[PDB]
Amino acid sequence: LPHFIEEPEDAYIIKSNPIALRCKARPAMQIFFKCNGEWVHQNEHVSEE
Amino acid sequence: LQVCLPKGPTCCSRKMEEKYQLTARLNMEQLLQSASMELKFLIIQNAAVFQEAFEIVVRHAKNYTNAMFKNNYPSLTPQAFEFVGEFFTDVSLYILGSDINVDDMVNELFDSLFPVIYTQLMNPGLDINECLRGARRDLKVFGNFPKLIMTQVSKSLQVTRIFLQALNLGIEVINTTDHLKFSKDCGRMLTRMWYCSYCQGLMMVKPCGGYCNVVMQGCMAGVVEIDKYWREYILSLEELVNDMENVLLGLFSTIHDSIQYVQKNAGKLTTTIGKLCTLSSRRRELIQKLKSFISFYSALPGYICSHSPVAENDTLCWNGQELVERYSQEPVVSQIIDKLKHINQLLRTMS
Ligand SMILES: *[C@@H]1O[C@H](CO)[C@@H](O)[C@H](O)[C@H]1NC(C)=O
Ligand SMILES: *[C@@H]1O[C@H](CO)[C@@H](O)[C@H](O)[C@H]1NC(C)=O
């Protein structure tokens, strides 16, 4: 099963500066975000192999 | 027995009498609920609607000012986004009754706006920032725009906040109405009027209309006194309605003109600083439907007697202790009165 190396940490927005959320796991082929119950659009995700 | 006056034999004991008393309490509460439900729902609806409408107006004004900054002053973003969000958040908070000072809102807004103007529009090229914040107020760089904005938004936000508070207090008093507990003697009189006829073995006998009138006038003694204050509350609200949206929408025009006014003296400002450092339709319809309830506390005993089984003919009816052929004839209330007095004084002094 996939083991998370870099689990997302609760971010805080300061002075309207958008802070992105990090996610790193191995072994992983597809990683998606489920923000507030629903899936996040494919365009918002930025994958690194 | 202690409630049903025993003329002779009786079919009920003390326990059945306590049962009749509890059922009388429940029936009276249900009747008051049925009388107050429509007005309660109306005021709850309007409170929710106006709160949502005001939040929509605040959001619209917020990103209108955001769009005007983004289109006309792209060099001031994203700091402009931050202090505009802060200002409109504080505006929404003051609208929702929080302890917020309008003059302090405008002053913090302009103290945040001036340094980015100086660093990105007048002198393109951080730790001396507080000195610039001071120069905002010590040199009066924005002229008379800040006092104008202060008065314009303070008037509208204060009247809107008082309007929402008045709506909530109306909700509170109408919801207290159907929960009013009455005296023991009033309860015993209700038990005698509604159920003690069954203790005597009568099946379909209804109480006399005049007996219901005297019983209800004895019970609703303090409640009818609320009628004058409720009428004055309705009239003061109608006076107050006859706006927050226009001010919050013209805010961006005023801020843009203030920025131009500041830029018109950059020549000397940079040198001296370097040296020194359907809503109206909804209110109208609400007022028109609310005026139809100005006699709510005066027609309430009439409602209770007309919506209960009564012998309006006063012939072969129950007078409370026998079957006759012809009838012969505060603390919580004080709190409601005090709250009404307060809200009425506020509505009077506003408009
Ligand atoms: C995230 O935002 C930064 C700037 O805020 C930008 O450079 C980057 O391309 C953005 N990525 C996505 C996926 O939006
Ligand atoms: C209104 O907010 C949206 C949110 O994404 C933004 O795209 C838009 O540019 C804003 N309006 C302006 C500044 O014209």
Both tokens of residue A12? Answer: 């805080």
**Residue B154 near ligand 2, beta carbon < 6 Å:** no
**Cα Rg for chain B, rounded, in angstroms?**
32
Both tokens of residue B251? Answer: 């805010």
What pairing do the DSSP bridges indicate for beta strands A38-39 and A34-35? antiparallel
- Looking at residue B65, its amino acid is T
Structure method: X-ray
Q: Which atom of ligand 2 is nearest to the CA of B66?
A: 13
Q: Which atom of ligand 1 is nearest to the CA of A20?
A: 1
Both tokens of residue B238? Answer: 């109608």
Residues 6+ apart with CB under 8 A from A14: none
Contact by Cβ (8 Å): B210, B326: no
Residue A26: its H or E element: strand A24-26
Residues 6+ apart with CB under 8 A from B13: none
CA A29 to chain B, closest CA, distance in angstroms equals 36
Looking at the DSSP bridge assignments, the partners of residue A34 are A39
Closest CA to B278 of B251, B238, B243: B243
Q: How far is the CA of A43 from the centre of ligand 2 (A)?
A: 19
d(CA B257, CA B268): 19
Three-class DSSP category at B240: helix
The total number of residues written for chain B in this structure: 351
**Cα Rg for chain A, rounded, in angstroms?**
12
H helices of B13-121, in order, are: 14-72, 79-95, 102-117
**Resolution limit in angstroms?**
4.1
Closest CA to B202 of B20, B10, B18, B27: B10
CA B73 to chain A, closest CA, distance in angstroms equals 17
Number of H helices, E strands in chain B: 15, 2
Three-class DSSP category at A3: strand
Contact by Cβ (8 Å): B347, B237: yes
What pairing do the DSSP bridges indicate for beta strands A3-6 and A24-26? antiparallel
Three-class DSSP category at B266: helix
Closest CA to B117 of B274, B12, B266: B266
> What φ, ψ does residue B66 adopt, rounded to 5°?
-60, -45
> What φ, ψ does residue B6 adopt, rounded to 5°?
-75, 100
Please tell me if residue B295 touches chain A, with a CB cutoff of 8 Å: no
CA B76 to chain A, closest CA, distance in angstroms equals 13
d(CA B77, CA B150): 24
User: Is the omega angle on the peptide bond into residue A27 within 30 degrees of 0, that is, cis?
Assistant: yes
Residues of B in contact with A13 (CB under 8 A): none
d(CA B174, CA B170): 6
Q: From atom 1 of ligand 1, which residue's Cα is the shortest distance away?
A: A20
d(CA B284, CA B242): 9
Label residue B293 left, alpha or beta by phi (over 0 means left) and psi (-120 to 50 means alpha). Answer: alpha
d(CA B241, CA B280): 8
- Looking at residue B94, its amino acid is Y
d(CA B165, CA B340): 12
Other C-beta atoms closer than 10 Å to the C-beta of A29 total 7
Q: How far is the CA of B84 from the centre of ligand 1 (A)?
A: 23
d(CA B241, CA B154): 17
- Burial bucket for residue B333 (CB in 10 Å: 0-12, 13-18, 19+): middle
d(CA B259, CA B323): 86
Contact by Cβ (8 Å): B347, B239: yes
Cα–Cα distances (Å) from B241 to A36, B27, B58, B340, in that order, read 41, 38, 20, 18
Q: How far is the CA of A33 from the centre of ligand 1 (A)?
A: 16
The overall longest dimension of chain A from CA atoms, in Å, is 39
Q: Which of B82, B88, B129 to mutate to test the interface with A (most CBs of A within 10 A)?
A: B82
Residues of A in contact with B78 (CB under 8 A): 15-17
**Residue B63 near ligand 2, beta carbon < 6 Å:** yes
Supply the DSSP symbol for B321.
S
The total number of residues written for chain A in this structure: 49
d(CA B64, CA B252): 7
d(CA B152, CA B248): 9
Contact by Cβ (8 Å): A21, A12: no
d(CA B168, CA B287): 15
d(CA B260, CA B273): 18
Label residue B251 left, alpha or beta by phi (over 0 means left) and psi (-120 to 50 means alpha). Answer: alpha
Q: CA torsion B230→B235→B237→B242, rounded to 10°? A: 170
After what residues is chain A interrupted, C–N > 2.5 A? none
**Residue A19 near ligand 1, beta carbon < 6 Å:** no
Both tokens of residue A41? Answer: 């659009």
Contact by Cβ (8 Å): B102, B124: no
Q: Which atom of ligand 1 is nearest to the CA of A46?
A: 13
Supply the DSSP symbol for B208.
B
